[PDB]
Ligand binder design. Structure first.
Ligand SMILES: Cc1cc2nc3c(=O)[nH]c(=O)nc-3n(C[C@H](O)[C@H](O)[C@H](O)COP(=O)(O)OP(=O)(O)OC[C@H]3O[C@@H](n4cnc5c(N)ncnc54)[C@H](O)[C@@H]3O)c2cc1C
Ligand SMILES: Cc1ncc(C[n+]2csc(CCOP(=O)(O)OP(=O)(O)O)c2C)c(N)n1
Ligand SMILES: [Mg+2]
Lengths: 89, 531
């Protein structure tokens, strides 16, 4: 029922306000966020945990409207990764 | 060629062909103003309120087809730009908005602009200033256009650095499959009752949209943003559809078996209740923004492209059918439909009898705007300037000022109401000091009015907080701003003469506050449920 999106974005402060604000503004459900800079690179990854809705490709179209988003993919990792990750904190 | 940041900004603006720039100076933007004093190419118009600066930039932009630029300082200058920029966003207009900011070493202008811009910038060092501006002007004008906000710290403006800036031009339009164009041509050729549904996105393709409408003999309806895409009297013109559209065509659309949607976005105010809007109609939808395809109605053929390029590849494949029986049906439904001195409609008609097709028409927001949309014979693209998406009161007068500046030859008539005109009343000064050819046609109902109609028709306790006493003299005010005034009280002779002679003018007309914009679709209703 859930998917991970991998976003490749330009790393500046703050593309994350752009992306987070997009998700709030349009009432997209998000149930886990992880952002990490890509090493030796001017880019960062944003991973989102979304629902595999009828709404999902509209979600992607919206996200691809952001200038700083260089790419957005459906990421093949299991969606129960996110929750399990909490264990390391 | 070595520049200070401010001098580079001005030089870049020159090389994009900007001849006019409008704003208001303040501390954090004073360096650019210094550089701007030296330009032999760019004149600067001093607004009286940064919202006014932005809407004047908007009037330029809505008439040229190119980005227009407005400028303000940090803090209240930036915050005052907000409404103008958000209005630019929802109606898809190319604006570049430049704001000074405190030295990099306050108000979060970047943060505030995030949700109301097509993109925005905070220039943190001067080495980014070339790319920033070149990309801003690309972003503002490509695909679906919009405002870009560039915030530039004062210490970046007064820095110096070393570089030749070209004219940024539009990104290339998307590609689209020939199978798609074939499938649409087949659906149009095989449709019993098609309608062509035009929106604000077809605005730079009047030739091919007309060619298509007439070849296939399509009944064509327009949104508020598409008025003039066919001349008002055109025999295929269903006029405008929707909340206050024309009843006959609201019923006619429900008879359609296929609708061809070019440059429209199925806004509720044109469509009504989505699921009850043309249920028996297959849909073709061509839009430059992927995110609009399937956002509200799911199309059977969806093309993400520029309308011109599609219609170029589509018109030679569309057969030329008389569609005789469908036209008899259109006419039969029209023979059951309402129809229209110093009346509100009569005033619109009288003002139109004063000018050419060469006029530019601007409006504020409310009943006077819907009345004007209904009755004025708008017959040219980029002749009709209204705020539709955001629906901003106060858009009209500064938009007309911009239109005047961008076309000094033409006449700009601005249909306004008593409530909206006060929102940017200060720009009256801006109109007279530049001696611009803008004629405000004020329908003064001594009421808000669109609210007056919504409360009286739909809320149980009726009109509240929507009326004025009538102890405001608008002629006195417009005269004190330096405009000629008129109060119909030969009336026409005074009208034609006040329009004929140059300079900015205010023309005032009393209208009963009980008058209505009909038909109306109650909010949340189907388009077949009209009052
Ligand atoms: C009081 C009031 C009453 C109103 N009443 C009505 C009414 O009765 N009827 C009505 O229709 N509106 C009405 N409006 C306006 C309404 O709110 C919307 O602004 C309008 O309906 C939207 O029209 P549109 O679909 O053209 O949108 P727009 O925003 O004008 O069109 C932009 C669309 O065109 C696309 N586009 C742009 N360029 C291209 C291109 N080259 N190729 C392809 N696609 C392109 C964009 O991607 C986008 O989808 C009213 C507004 C107010 C304030
Ligand atoms: C800034 C702003 N505040 C409130 C509204 C809501 N609103 C829309 S129309 C309207 C009334 C319009 O008043 P007026 O200028 O008198 O036009 P009229 O109805 O009389 O033709 C109001 C209050 C708005 N659109 N914009
Ligand atoms: Mg009024």
């Amino acid at each position: 029922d859930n998917v991970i999106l991998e976003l490749t974005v330009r790393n500046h402060p703050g593309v994350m306000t752009h992306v987070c604000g997009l998700f709030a503004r349009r009432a997209f459900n998000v149930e886990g966020i992880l952002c990490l800079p890509i090493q030796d690179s001017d880019k960062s990854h944003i991973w989102l945990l979304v629902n595999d809705d009828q709404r999902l490709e509209q979600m992607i179209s919206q996200i691809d409207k952001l200038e700083d988003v260089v790419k957005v993919q459906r990421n093949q990792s299991d969606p129960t990764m996110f929750n399990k990750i909490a264990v390391f904190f | 060629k070595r520049f200070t940041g401010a001098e580079f900004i001005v030089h870049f603006l020159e090389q994009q062909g900007i001849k006019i720039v409008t704003g208001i100076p303040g501390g954090s933007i004073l360096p650019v103003y210094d550089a701007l004093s030296q330009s032999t190419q760019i004149r600067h118009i001093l607004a009286r309120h940064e919202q006014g600066a932005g809407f004047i930039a908007q009037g330029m932009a809505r008439t040229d087809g190119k980005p227009a630029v407005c400028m303000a300082c940090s803090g209240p200058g930036a915050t005052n730009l907000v409404t103008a920029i958000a209005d630019a966003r929802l109606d898809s207009i190319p604006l570049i908005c430049i704001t000074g900011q405190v030295p990099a070493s306050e108000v979060d202008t970047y943060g505030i602009s995030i949700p109301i811009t097509k993109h925005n910038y905070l220039v943190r060092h001067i080495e980014e200033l070339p790319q920033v501006m070149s990309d801003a002007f690309r972003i503002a004008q490509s695909g679906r256009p919009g405002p870009v906000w560039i915030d530039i710290p004062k210490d970046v403006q007064t820095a110096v650095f070393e570089i030749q800036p070209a004219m940024a031009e539009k990104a290339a339009a998307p590609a689209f499959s020939e199978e798609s164009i074939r499938d649409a041509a087949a659906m149009i050729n095989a449709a019993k009752r098609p309608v062509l549904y035009l929106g604000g996105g077809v605005i730079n393709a009047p030739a091919r949209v007309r060619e298509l409408a007439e070849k296939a003999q399509l009944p064509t309806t327009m949104t508020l943003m598409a008025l003039g895409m066919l001349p008002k009297a055109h025999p295929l013109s269903l006029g405008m559809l929707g909340m206050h559209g024309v009843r006959s065509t609201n019923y006619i659309l429900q008879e359609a078996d296929l609708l061809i949607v070019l440059g429209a976005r199925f806004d509720d105010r044109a469509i009504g209740k989505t699921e009850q809007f043309c249920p028996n109609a297959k849909i073709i939808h061509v839009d430059i923004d992927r995110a609009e395809l399937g956002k509200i109605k799911q199309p059977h053929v969806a093309i993400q492209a520029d309308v011109d390029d599609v219609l170029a590849q589509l018109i030679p494949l569309v057969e030329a059918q008389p569609r005789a029986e469908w036209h008899q049906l259109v006419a039969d439904l029209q023979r059951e439909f309402p129809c229209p001195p110093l009346s509100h409609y009569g005033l619109i008609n009288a003002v139109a009898a004063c000018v050419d097709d060469n006029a530019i028409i601007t409006t504020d927001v409310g009943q006077h705007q819907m009345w004007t949309a209904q009755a004025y014979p708008l017959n040219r693209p980029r002749q009709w300037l209204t705020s539709g998406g955001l629906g901003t009161m106060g858009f009209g007068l500064p938009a007309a000022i911009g239109a005047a500046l961008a076309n000094p030859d033409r006449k700009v008539l601005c249909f306004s109401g008593d409530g909206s005109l006060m929102m940017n009343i200060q720009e009256m000064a801006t109109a007279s000091e530049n001696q611009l050819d803008v004629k405000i046609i004020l329908m003064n109902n001594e009421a808000l009015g669109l609210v007056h109609q919504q409360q009286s028709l739909f809320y149980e306790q009726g009109v509240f907080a929507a009326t004025y006493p009538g102890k405001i003299n608008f002629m006195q005010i417009a005269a004190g701003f330096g405009l000629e005034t008129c109060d119909l009280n030969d009336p026409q002779a005074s009208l034609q003469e006040i329009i004929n002679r140059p300079g900015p003018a205010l023309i005032h007309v009393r209208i009963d506050a009980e008058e209505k914009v009909y038909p109306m679709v109650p909010p949340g209703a189907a388009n077949t449920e009209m009052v």
